[PDB]
Structure 1
Amino acid sequence: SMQDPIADMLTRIRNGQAANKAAVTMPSSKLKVAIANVLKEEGFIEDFKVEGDTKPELELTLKYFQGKAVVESIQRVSRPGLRIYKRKDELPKVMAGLGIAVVSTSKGVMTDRAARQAGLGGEIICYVA
């Protein structure tokens, strides 16, 4: 079952990007949003929406560049049944910096760089290259 919601979003993204699709649909959730936000605020997706008041969806728009998709690669990290928490001096650097590491901190779910400089660690999420 959907024991891991986050993973669904990540996977649903790369898969779509591969089949060349405008956006992607999926039931959003509190976290799914914050995560998707970073994906936008960082340059991986045009925008996103959450249709449905009773049952929230997610008009996550996919982004592309030349003859290829922007999202070159994105995999899950702190997956369930195997969580991952790192300290301020532990936060990794996705693709030597050319990538992003979504991390959830007690101050919010931003990128590695932001959370790192802020001086606080947090549970990692994914490594959107």
Structure 2
Amino acid sequence: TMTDPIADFLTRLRNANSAYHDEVTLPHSKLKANIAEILKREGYISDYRTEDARVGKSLVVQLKYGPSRERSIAGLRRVSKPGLRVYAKSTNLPRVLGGLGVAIISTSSGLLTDRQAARQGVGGEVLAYVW
């Protein structure tokens, strides 16, 4: 059965990115929408919107490609997963691509990046890495 919706979202993104699709659709949830918000604000995806589906609602994500058709996402990794979950304090927050990437952290203040969490002095669960 489906165990990790977040990892399934990340793999849909990765598979669409490898296939040079301009479009990727998936069932909607609040957490996935928040991750889409962070990805868009950090400039990794072009734009996202949420339609409605036959049963519930869908999430639609536009993949950003450069003029010469080079992908704007180099990698997508799921860090904390069901089973082994990863939490980090405000001081040992992870670095992605030596700081060139972004780590998404679920704090009690919401979804933040590694830099935002470090600046606000908070910790939480390390959801994923984007670079």
Q: TM-score range by the shorter chain?
A: over 0.9
- Partner Cα separation in structure 2 for residue 90 and residue 64 of structure 1: 33
Q: Which moves more between the two structures, 3-12 or 62-71?
A: 62-71
Distance 1:110 1:38 in 2: 8
Amino acid at match of 1:55: G
Cross-structure match for 2:73: 71
Give the C-alpha shift of residue 67 in structure 1. Answer: 3.2
1:45 and 2:39 equivalent? Answer: no
Q: Partner of 2:17 in structure 1?
A: 17
Name structure 2 gaps, 5 residues minimum: none
Which residues of 2 match residues 41-120 of structure 1 at below 5 A?
41-52=41-52, 55-65=56-66, 66-120=68-122
**Offset at residue 7 of structure 1 (A):** 0.3
Residue aligning to 2:124: 122
Distance 1:21 1:67 in 2: 11
- Residue-by-residue CA offset, 1:105-124 (whole Å, 9 max, x unaligned): 00011111001110000100
| Structure (1 or 2) with the greater strand fraction | 2
Find the aligned partners of 1:28 and 1:120 in 2 and give their Cα distance: 28
2 CA distance for matches of 1:79 and 1:15? 19
Q: Deviation digits for residues 33-60 of structure 1, max 9, x if unmatched?
A: 1111100000111110111175110111
* Larger proportion of helix: 1
The letter for the 1-side match of 2:56 is K
**In structure 2, distance between residues paired with 1:35 and 1:85:** 17
2-side partners of 1:97 and 1:43: how far apart? 15
Aligned to 1:5: 5
Between 1:65-74 and 1:107-116, the stretch displaced more is 65-74
The alignment's TM-score, normalised by the length of structure 2, stands at 0.94
Count, aligned residues = 129
Kindly provide the amino acid, as one letter, of the partner of residue 23 in structure 1: E
RMSD: 1.1
- Using the aligned pairs only, state the percent identity: 47
